[PDB]
Design an enzyme around this catalytic site. Structure first.
Site, PDB file in Angstrom:
ATOM      1  N   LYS A 205       0.832  -1.192   0.000  1.00 48.78           N
ATOM      2  CA  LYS A 205       0.000   0.000   0.000  1.00 48.78           C
ATOM      3  C   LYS A 205       0.874   1.251   0.000  1.00 48.78           C
ATOM      4  CE  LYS A 205      -3.872   2.162   2.363  1.00 48.78           C
ATOM      5  NZ  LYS A 205      -4.349   2.698   1.064  1.00 48.78           N
TER       6      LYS A 205
ATOM      7  N   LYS B 161       7.243   0.787   2.456  1.00 49.49           N
ATOM      8  CA  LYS B 161       8.039   0.131   1.424  1.00 49.49           C
ATOM      9  C   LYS B 161       9.436   0.722   1.337  1.00 49.49           C
ATOM     10  CE  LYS B 161       4.274   0.732  -1.502  1.00 49.49           C
ATOM     11  NZ  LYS B 161       4.315   1.908  -0.588  1.00 49.49           N
TER      12      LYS B 161
ATOM     13  N   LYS C 166       9.123  10.539  -7.092  1.00 47.62           N
ATOM     14  CA  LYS C 166       9.533  11.499  -6.074  1.00 47.62           C
ATOM     15  C   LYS C 166      11.002  11.351  -5.716  1.00 47.62           C
ATOM     16  CE  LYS C 166       5.127  10.267  -3.960  1.00 47.62           C
ATOM     17  NZ  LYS C 166       4.666   9.430  -2.817  1.00 47.62           N
TER      18      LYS C 166
ATOM     19  N   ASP D 176       1.055   3.027  -5.822  1.00 49.58           N
ATOM     20  CA  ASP D 176       0.020   3.028  -6.850  1.00 49.58           C
ATOM     21  C   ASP D 176       0.651   2.482  -8.128  1.00 49.58           C
ATOM     22  OD1 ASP D 176      -2.559   4.089  -5.790  1.00 49.58           O
ATOM     23  OD2 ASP D 176      -1.292   5.785  -5.223  1.00 49.58           O
TER      24      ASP D 176
HETATM   25  N1  LIG Z   1      -7.273   9.278  11.977  1.00 42.93           N
HETATM   26  C1  LIG Z   1      -7.133   7.912  11.827  1.00 42.93           C
HETATM   27  N2  LIG Z   1      -7.247   7.099  12.871  1.00 42.93           N
HETATM   28  C2  LIG Z   1      -7.106   5.802  12.705  1.00 42.93           C
HETATM   29  N3  LIG Z   1      -6.857   5.214  11.560  1.00 42.93           N
HETATM   30  C3  LIG Z   1      -6.729   5.956  10.466  1.00 42.93           C
HETATM   31  C4  LIG Z   1      -6.865   7.352  10.564  1.00 42.93           C
HETATM   32  N4  LIG Z   1      -6.693   7.877   9.329  1.00 42.93           N
HETATM   33  C5  LIG Z   1      -6.459   6.875   8.477  1.00 42.93           C
HETATM   34  N5  LIG Z   1      -6.470   5.688   9.145  1.00 42.93           N
HETATM   35  C6  LIG Z   1      -6.267   4.356   8.569  1.00 42.93           C
HETATM   36  O1  LIG Z   1      -5.028   4.239   7.893  1.00 42.93           O
HETATM   37  C7  LIG Z   1      -5.251   3.626   6.597  1.00 42.93           C
HETATM   38  C8  LIG Z   1      -5.082   4.688   5.512  1.00 42.93           C
HETATM   39  O2  LIG Z   1      -5.965   4.384   4.434  1.00 42.93           O
HETATM   40  P1  LIG Z   1      -6.584   5.508   3.472  1.00 42.93           P
HETATM   41  O3  LIG Z   1      -7.459   6.537   4.342  1.00 42.93           O
HETATM   42  O4  LIG Z   1      -7.462   4.873   2.470  1.00 42.93           O
HETATM   43  O5  LIG Z   1      -5.384   6.289   2.749  1.00 42.93           O
HETATM   44  P2  LIG Z   1      -5.232   6.966   1.302  1.00 42.93           P
HETATM   45  O6  LIG Z   1      -6.685   6.919   0.622  1.00 42.93           O
HETATM   46  O7  LIG Z   1      -4.739   8.345   1.440  1.00 42.93           O
HETATM   47  O8  LIG Z   1      -4.183   6.068   0.481  1.00 42.93           O
HETATM   48  C9  LIG Z   1      -6.672   3.029   6.657  1.00 42.93           C
HETATM   49  O9  LIG Z   1      -6.711   1.772   7.320  1.00 42.93           O
HETATM   50  C10 LIG Z   1      -7.352   4.103   7.505  1.00 42.93           C
HETATM   51  O10 LIG Z   1      -8.575   3.639   8.076  1.00 42.93           O
HETATM   52  N1  LIG Z   2       7.646   0.631  11.335  1.00 44.82           N
HETATM   53  C1  LIG Z   2       7.708   2.011  11.255  1.00 44.82           C
HETATM   54  N2  LIG Z   2       8.176   2.730  12.266  1.00 44.82           N
HETATM   55  C2  LIG Z   2       8.203   4.040  12.176  1.00 44.82           C
HETATM   56  N3  LIG Z   2       7.844   4.742  11.133  1.00 44.82           N
HETATM   57  C3  LIG Z   2       7.379   4.095  10.073  1.00 44.82           C
HETATM   58  C4  LIG Z   2       7.292   2.691  10.096  1.00 44.82           C
HETATM   59  N4  LIG Z   2       6.788   2.286   8.908  1.00 44.82           N
HETATM   60  C5  LIG Z   2       6.559   3.371   8.162  1.00 44.82           C
HETATM   61  N5  LIG Z   2       6.912   4.492   8.850  1.00 44.82           N
HETATM   62  C6  LIG Z   2       6.831   5.877   8.387  1.00 44.82           C
HETATM   63  O1  LIG Z   2       5.660   6.116   7.626  1.00 44.82           O
HETATM   64  C7  LIG Z   2       6.018   6.954   6.498  1.00 44.82           C
HETATM   65  C8  LIG Z   2       5.864   6.180   5.199  1.00 44.82           C
HETATM   66  O2  LIG Z   2       7.024   6.463   4.415  1.00 44.82           O
HETATM   67  P1  LIG Z   2       7.621   5.357   3.419  1.00 44.82           P
HETATM   68  O3  LIG Z   2       8.346   4.195   4.278  1.00 44.82           O
HETATM   69  O4  LIG Z   2       8.580   5.993   2.491  1.00 44.82           O
HETATM   70  O5  LIG Z   2       6.364   4.781   2.610  1.00 44.82           O
HETATM   71  P2  LIG Z   2       6.159   4.085   1.179  1.00 44.82           P
HETATM   72  O6  LIG Z   2       7.575   3.521   0.706  1.00 44.82           O
HETATM   73  O7  LIG Z   2       5.152   3.013   1.316  1.00 44.82           O
HETATM   74  O8  LIG Z   2       5.741   5.222   0.127  1.00 44.82           O
HETATM   75  C9  LIG Z   2       7.469   7.400   6.719  1.00 44.82           C
HETATM   76  O9  LIG Z   2       7.556   8.533   7.580  1.00 44.82           O
HETATM   77  C10 LIG Z   2       8.000   6.146   7.419  1.00 44.82           C
HETATM   78  O10 LIG Z   2       9.225   6.440   8.080  1.00 44.82           O
HETATM   79 MG   LIG Z   3       8.161   4.474  -1.314  1.00 40.52          MG
END
Ligand SMILES: Nc1ncnc2c1ncn2[C@@H]1O[C@H](COP(=O)(O)OP(=O)(O)O)[C@@H](O)[C@H]1O
Ligand SMILES: Nc1ncnc2c1ncn2[C@@H]1O[C@H](COP(=O)(O)OP(=O)(O)O)[C@@H](O)[C@H]1O
Ligand SMILES: [Mg+2]
Ligand code: CLF
Ligand code: SF4
Ligand SMILES: [Mg+2]
Lengths: 269, 467, 445, 274, 313
Positions: D8, D13, D39, D125
């Site tokens: 996701k 990732k 990015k 995506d």
């Molecule tokens: N304020 C929140 N409190 C708890 N869980 C959240 C909150 N905001 C997002 N999440 C959860 O984190 C995940 C993010 O999903 P989503 O809202 O669909 O992200 P996006 O559409 O931006 O890719 C979902 O499981 C969502 O329910």
């Molecule tokens: N296990 C984790 N502990 C702390 N921060 C996390 C963890 N997993 C994800 N994050 C944070 O959530 C955000 C998602 O970033 P990123 O890892 O680059 O996502 P993606 O590669 O899926 O686009 C970043 O700030 C990342 O450091």
């Molecule tokens: Mg990434």
């Protein structure tokens, strides 16, 4: 119809916040349409109860009204849809869906008060930036949290939006905060918004009421209307409803955000 | 070296350094090694190369629009058959006919169905697949289908990656077809060496190498164009690979020498006395026929030279101009000097500083400049006729030389006749010089049409810029 | 099946010739390096050896999208191209045509062309990607784009009143119908004969963009095509309120031309004396060239072909099928329409072939694949005599194999040189008769 | 061995891929991390955060590309290379990744660096066939999707399984398992374990949500780098060990919409009383 | 003699007996703006109907009243009875009608405008129309307006033909031979030389002209353009002209024959093209096509180069 778009980092709460905003607005009597620009077809998951509905692209002459499904509060849930991951072109799919919706005059033959474009996290082609063109959306907000990569994605999206803002398109309305619980989160998400000359619409904390409503396939407005998170989302929907101050983005450079992050690393040490 | 491990051919600009813009003196283009009007793409060259292979079917994985080029190349194919003493028939190019949904969800099933239809309808010995701009933007992954269907049917299934936007010049469309044929059709490690057969990398022009090398006791294997999958297959067994134009002959011949061990001739192109002599000395030195050549060099020098004295007299002080191609253009600029025609300007659609053979002794421009003097208004432009008008008024020639479309009509509206040389063998060799003299004489007689047009026509350009 | 051997039409960006067909109009293409050259060299140069014209062929500006215009977009390339074109070329109107790349990538073309229009620059943009359709769909798109972005709003008190006796003519596709120049000349000549002021909108007879600015002032719209031009007509009816007359059959010959002119006159309300006097003179000229042909074709020893097979776009396909049935009395064999009409118009198109004569009823199959066309020609036994194939350069081999003759009447007509030849109306019908029977007689030559 | 990491959006990732890449590099492996994100942030934590020009940023400013000029040496010696691309809302990033991968394949840099692991960190995506290039029958065989306890993360994981299944039945890559991210409570582990068990797949490891990561991120450093002896770096070292020796890849067997819905509904009744 | 002598006897007989004598106060005053045309032999020039249509159209366009006297465009014995009422007699032929013109001059006194070269194209047609206007003193405004309109139409189709003419892939024939009556022979030579710029290779006039006019025709071919000087021979036997065609050298390029059905086999022997322009045209059906004027030159180009490119057809 006050037309809004939601951007930000992927999986950060664009669809959650968007569905909560739409539910709180439809709780106030308004008519809201939420359009999903993600081919996963999950933006309006919490508005339809989790049940699968056909998308626009599953109809590709067409009658775009057959892809309109309304859920909670009468919210008009429209999903662009697309292929399974890794084939085809979903950007052209969103272009095709929006073109079909415009040619069918859905936004005006329906009497909607609000239209919120929920877009996917990785804006990669000009087909995902269709909402922020001229005459489509005017208020665009980018969801972000205290995570540094969330801020990075928001700044990169400001760079992307600036091209449309300078070319007669949508202007950056502000920033939506999500998963803001501690004071450090608020401080680090306020510093970024002050450095970029925009305004945090509101702050949303991370609560397990959203997790519970999600698993249930509902939104916090429907799930727990008497909970704190639902009231926070009602305030956010009201703020979005009366928001007017949108400015051309002024994103930080690579070195600027690199030093900003280094200046905030030491705040946690 | 050429990378044959990949199913995608690199571009000509990336592999050589193609220059599709320049203006100056040919000596400088030799030392160095906002507005557009449309060009050719590589998909069209793939259509004209792999679509003219006899016994094979080319599949166009594109929207139906990219398949428009079947008409021109079908006409050229039919006329080439008629010229080369073969039965005349239409070529069969099949298009996947992709639509908007195939742009959204991918069009790989349609590609597989089209390949199966090609196999069912024609049962060829090979199937080529042509990629386009939209199916490369979406990344349709044609190689998996190609491999599966090749394993199923048995005949090779060759994916050619020939998108228009991949390269800025269309000469990469030759690279694609040659790459596919080298990787799939040409048999490796053969057990038969046809020492009397030579691979002539040519087009659909009158057979002149047949009789010319027959005096040298050689058999001619015309390849790619009007060639049979078996002729393409027995290209590792020939004793040498030759061609008339350097531009169309670099990739295949160099790759044959590197991989299949087919000797490659590093000799000047056969245009003019010196060029054709040096070309025959080496095509007959590779095949060990350096005894029937001097007896053919002398015979032609004793046959065409007496007729070329009166032919140079009928063209004194006549100005010429070559506006087409890259290497089948330096050959004209050098043959015309053989007739004494003045050539103080030219237009080549691109310029390759180096060739796939990478041999220094294969520069057509250096041969044209060191022998037969320099061109003072040399100009490179990717078939743009807003720049051709400026060049035409700069040099003001009596006649021009064209082979590709798009430039002759502008000169016609300026009153400047053009020599069309679709039959690329008309100006090859000694009889080539004798034919080009007659062609110039005939064209100069045709000058009355272009002068009538020039006096009753309006150019689209604006006088603010026309100046 | 999806496959298409031996294409029967070209890209939607090939409607650049619809804009180039308007006098003093130069289309601009935003596409790959070879889309413009391919579309011109196949729909014009090897389809009757027609030339580029004033603003066609190698005159058309093109962005020639490289790998940079795909990965990073090419809207700035189109902006720069328009800026340079406004100073290099002299055009009344510029038309911007996007290829399949800008449409897939999602380039914001409006954000580039709009600024030019706001300065009063006569420029227009249309979205014609390769995946959208063939050149017929692109033709409709180009017409609508030019209308909306150049003709603009209409005010009778400012832009001029509406003339009930001025007609916009929406007819065969320029440069795709090989004889379009002469055919449009004939159509305009007949319409001016019956007493109309004609906005032919294409070809040498047209007045340029001044004729297009007069579209709203026209009394009505004529759609001289079975299906093409009906979108434009509907858009105009919605926008300006102009009534439309749909004449699906293009009138080859005096029998069809008389009826066509009578129906147009009954539409407008023209004087029934000028119509029957122009028609009287046209019949008088036309019939006297027939008696002598009769002598040949009613007393030819070696016999004439009796069965034909027309394979071409709906306009010519149906005009030729109507003429070869109601005039020559030929046996209608295999008819195949290969321009890929929209599915909604197919039923009525076919219903026209049902009533192709009071004594003759036939039918057409919509087939864009030439392999299936060839196989249905092979799978239709054409009696004992040889059949005459009315198709393209793809039917040469098949006609040689079936012992019959071939008359090329559409895209691609690779073995005809066409300058002013017409096959419509009276003079065009005579020329068509000459071509057909010269080809048939030339079998022992 | 060539690996691809999916999942996701915003799920970790890039972070988990960088952590496991650094763990592999510290063990002495030649690992190259290829960022398939416009990015250009996939390898941000391997370079300290400073911007590095990509391959698509060498194409727009040059005519002949030498893929080496775009290879940058990151923390631990990782060949951190970014594909790059346009700014959001312009261009075509999928074709950009196609061009990048094609370029480095033609240059044969996958074989001239004497590498041990080639890990493709993809975006979240996967919208076109340009981003499915690293799972395309000859470029990688081990595909892992990062997922969390959040139902939308599991939804994205199931959707990616459906997407990968097309390439698996084409000679392409097979799903190697599921990466579990941001798992602290026992419910977090239990729900993702049941999802994996319902899809005939495995969990390579569980990494919790920690502040070590956050802090090392702000600094532009990896958890293996910033905290070489913490309780979050050790989990990344063990997940790198578990991904190095992974061999039991399978064709993905995802759940349809109704099955995943019913499963989520069943797990909603367990969160109420946990 | 031949059918030409029979034609000039029939016309003289009608003029001498049916038309009779003329009284300007009885039959109507002589109209200075009415012209008699004596150009082509009907039914022997295969394309005579379209040719006379085009000639009448041009003459009417510059502002004259035309008595075409042959073909559908005529009115029959009404135009023949208006022969004495015409301002002048136009002989648009090298020698056919000169005897009739002299007979009319003796019987009536009409001046004769002799036009040996029949106009094909725009240059020849413009010169022809200006010479007729100068002879009859017509209003040069109408003349110039009509010329401008016709050339505007013509040079457009030529702006479209120029692409093929200058750009065709396989090249086009350079030399030609014309075999037929002197009228078409000369008209086609003048066209093919001045409009197209083709090289005259062999011109043979096969209608047996009288020796009193052959020197004039040879003079007309000695200056077929300001810079190319050709000639012509008179041979009425098909075997002799076939031998002279075989004895002629053209070059590496196969020529194009403007002969007839008798030169089909000979044309295939030389691997060239045969455009049947004379008699007998047994392999083409002709209804209304014309090969002269403004509109007929385009049809002529169409036929010539359709035949030229249709070798692989
Ligand atoms: N304020 C929140 N409190 C708890 N869980 C959240 C909150 N905001 C997002 N999440 C959860 O984190 C995940 C993010 O999903 P989503 O809202 O669909 O992200 P996006 O559409 O931006 O890719 C979902 O499981 C969502 O329910
Ligand atoms: N296990 C984790 N502990 C702390 N921060 C996390 C963890 N997993 C994800 N994050 C944070 O959530 C955000 C998602 O970033 P990123 O890892 O680059 O996502 P993606 O590669 O899926 O686009 C970043 O700030 C990342 O450091
Ligand atoms: Mg990434
Ligand atoms: S459907 Fe597309 S817009 Fe139509 S004609 Fe095709 S690209 Fe063009 Fe093609 S011909 Fe070559 S491969 Fe691209 S540049 Fe162009
Ligand atoms: S990046 Fe966008 S436009 Fe390009 S292929 Fe992917 S979805 Fe289509
Ligand atoms: Mg979402």
């Amino acid at each position: 119809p006050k037309q809004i778009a939601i951007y930000g980092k992927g999986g950060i709460g664009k669809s959650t916040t968007t569905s909560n905003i739409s539910a709180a607005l439809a709780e106030a009597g308004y008519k809201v349409m939420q359009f999903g620009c993600d081919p996963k077809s999950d933006s309006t998951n919490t508005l339809r109860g989790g049940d699968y509905i056909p998308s626009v692209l599953d109809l590709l002459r067409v009658d775009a009204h057959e892809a309109i499904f309304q859920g909670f509060g009468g919210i008009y849930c429209v999903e662009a849809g697309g292929p399974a991951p890794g084939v085809g072109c979903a950007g052209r799919g969103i272009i095709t869906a929006v073109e079909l919706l415009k040619q069918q005059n859905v936004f005006e033959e329906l009497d909607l008060d609000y239209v919120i474009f929920d877009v996917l996290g990785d804006v990669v082609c000009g087909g995902f930036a269709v909402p922020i063109r001229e005459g489509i959306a005017e208020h665009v907000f980018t969801v972000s949290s205290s995570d540094f990569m969330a801020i990075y994605a928001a700044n990169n999206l400001f760079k992307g939006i600036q091209k449309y803002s300078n070319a007669g398109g949508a202007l950056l309305g502000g920033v939506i905060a999500n998963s803001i619980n501690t004071d450090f989160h608020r401080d680090i998400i306020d510093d970024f918004v002050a450095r970029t000359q925009t305004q945090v619409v509101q702050y949303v904390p991370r609560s397990l009421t959203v997790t519970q409503a999600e698993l249930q396939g509902r939104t916090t407005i429907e799930a727990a209307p008497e909970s704190a998170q639902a009231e926070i989302y009602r305030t956010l929907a009201r703020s979005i409803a009366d928001h007017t101050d949108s400015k051309v983005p002024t994103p930080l450079n690579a070195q600027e955000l690199r030093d900003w992050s280094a200046s905030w690393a030491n705040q946690l040490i | 070296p050429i990378n044959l491990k990949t199913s995608v051919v690199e571009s000509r600009e990336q592999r050589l350094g193609t220059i599709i813009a320049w203006d100056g003196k040919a000596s400088d283009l030799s030392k160095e090694s906002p507005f557009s009007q449309g060009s050719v793409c590589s998909e069209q060259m793939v259509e004209c190369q792999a679509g003219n292979v006899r016994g094979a079917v080319l599949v166009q994985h594109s929207p139906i629009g990219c398949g428009a080029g079947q008409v021109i190349y079908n006409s050229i194919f039919r006329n080439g058959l008629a010229i080369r003493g073969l039965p005349v028939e239409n070529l069969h190019l099949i298009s996947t006919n992709l639509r908007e949904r195939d742009m959204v969800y991918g069009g790989l099933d349609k590609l597989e169905r089209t390949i199966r239809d090609a196999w069912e309808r024609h049962h060829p010995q090979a199937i080529f697949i042509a990629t386009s701009c939209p199916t490369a933007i979406i990344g349709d992954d044609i190689e998996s289908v190609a491999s599966q269907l090749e394993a199923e049917f048995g005949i090779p299934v060759i994916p050619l990656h020939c998108e228009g936007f991949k390269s800025k010049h269309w000469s990469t469309g030759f690279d694609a077809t040659q790459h596919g044929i080298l990787r799939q059709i040409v048999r490796k490690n053969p057990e038969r060496k046809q020492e009397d057969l030579v691979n002539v990398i040519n087009l659909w022009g009158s057979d002149v190498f047949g009789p010319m090398l027959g005096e040298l006791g050689l058999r001619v294997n015309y390849v790619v164009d009007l060639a049979t999958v078996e002729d393409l297959a027995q290209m590792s067994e020939a004793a040498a690979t030759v061609g008339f134009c350097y531009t169309l002959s670099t990739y295949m011949a160099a790759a044959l020498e590197q991989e299949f061990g087919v000797p490659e001739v590093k000799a000047p192109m056969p245009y003019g006395f010196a060029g054709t002599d040096a070309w025959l000395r080496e095509i007959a030195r590779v095949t060990h026929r350096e005894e029937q050549a001097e007896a053919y060099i002398a015979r032609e020098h004793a046959r065409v030279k007496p007729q070329l004295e009166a032919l140079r007299e009928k063209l004194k002080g006549i100005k010429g101009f070559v506006s087409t191609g890259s290497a089948y253009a330096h050959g004209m600029i050098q043959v015309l000097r053989e007739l004494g025609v003045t050539v103080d300007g030219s237009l080549v659609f691109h310029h390759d500083p180096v060739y796939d053979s990478q041999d220094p002794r294969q520069d057509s421009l250096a041969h044209l400049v060191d022998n037969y003097g320099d061109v003072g208004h040399f100009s490179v432009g990717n078939r743009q006729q807003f720049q051709f008008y400026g060049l035409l008024q700069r040099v003001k020639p009596d006649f021009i030389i064209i082979r590709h479309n798009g430039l002759a009509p502008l000169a016609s509206r300026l009153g400047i006749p053009a020599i069309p040389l679709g039959d690329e063998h008309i100006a090859v060799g000694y009889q080539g010089i004798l034919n080009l003299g007659e062609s110039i004489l005939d064209v100069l007689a045709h000058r009355k049409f272009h002068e009538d047009i020039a006096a009753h026509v309006r150019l689209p350009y604006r006088q603010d810029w026309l100046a | 099946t999806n496959s298409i051997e031996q294409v029967r039409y070209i890209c939607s960006i090939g409607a650049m010739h619809s804009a180039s067909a308007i006098p003093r109009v130069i289309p601009i293409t935003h596409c790959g390096p070879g889309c413009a050259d391919k579309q011109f060299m196949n729909v014009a140069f090897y389809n009757g050896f027609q030339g580029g014209g004033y603003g066609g062929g190698a005159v058309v500006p093109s962005t020639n999208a490289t790998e940079r215009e795909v990965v990073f977009g090419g809207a700035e390339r189109l902006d720069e191209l328009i800026g340079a074109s406004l100073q290099v070329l002299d055009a009344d109107l510029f038309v911007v045509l996007t290829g399949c790349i800008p449409d897939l990538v999602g380039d914001d073309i409006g954000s580039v062309v709009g600024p030019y229009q706001k300065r009063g620059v006569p420029i227009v943009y249309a979205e014609t990607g390769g995946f959208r359709g063939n050149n017929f769909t692109g033709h409709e798109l180009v017409t609508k784009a030019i209308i909306d972005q150049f003709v603009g709003d209409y005010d009778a008190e400012r832009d001029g009143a509406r003339e009930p006796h001025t007609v916009n003519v929406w007819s065969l596709l320029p440069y795709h119908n090989t004889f379009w120049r002469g055919d449009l000349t004939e159509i305009k000549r007949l319409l001016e004969g019956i007493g109309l002021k004609v906005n032919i909108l294409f070809g040498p007879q047209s007045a340029g963009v001044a004729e297009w600015k007069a579209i709203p002032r026209a009394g009505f719209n004529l759609v001289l095509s079975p299906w093409l031009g009906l979108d434009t007509a509907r858009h105009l009816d919605r926008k300006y309120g102009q009534p439309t007359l749909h004449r699906p059959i293009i009138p080859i010959g005096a029998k069809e031309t008389g009826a066509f002119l009578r129906e147009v006159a009954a539409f407008a309300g023209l004087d029934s004396a000028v119509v029957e006097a122009f028609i009287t003179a046209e019949e008088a000229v036309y019939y006297r060239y027939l008696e002598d042909f009769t002598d040949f074709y009613a007393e030819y020893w070696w016999g004439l072909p009796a069965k034909f097979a027309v394979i071409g776009d709906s306009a010519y396909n149906l005009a030729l099928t109507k003429f070869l049935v109601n005039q020559l009395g030929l046996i209608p064999g295999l008819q195949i329409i290969t321009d890929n009409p929209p599915e909604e118009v197919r039923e009525d198109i076919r219903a026209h072939y049902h009533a192709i004569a009071d004594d003759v009823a036939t039918d057409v199959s919509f087939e864009e694949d030439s392999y299936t066309i060839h196989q249905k020609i092979r799978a239709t036994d054409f009696g004992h005599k040889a059949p005459i194939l009315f198709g393209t350069t793809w039917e040469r081999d098949l006609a040689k194999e079936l012992k019959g003759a071939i008359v090329e009447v559409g895209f691609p007509a690779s073995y005809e040189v066409v300058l002013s030849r017409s096959y419509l109306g009276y003079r065009g019908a005579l020329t068509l008769l000459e071509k057909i029977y010269t080809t048939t007689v030339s079998a022992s030559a």
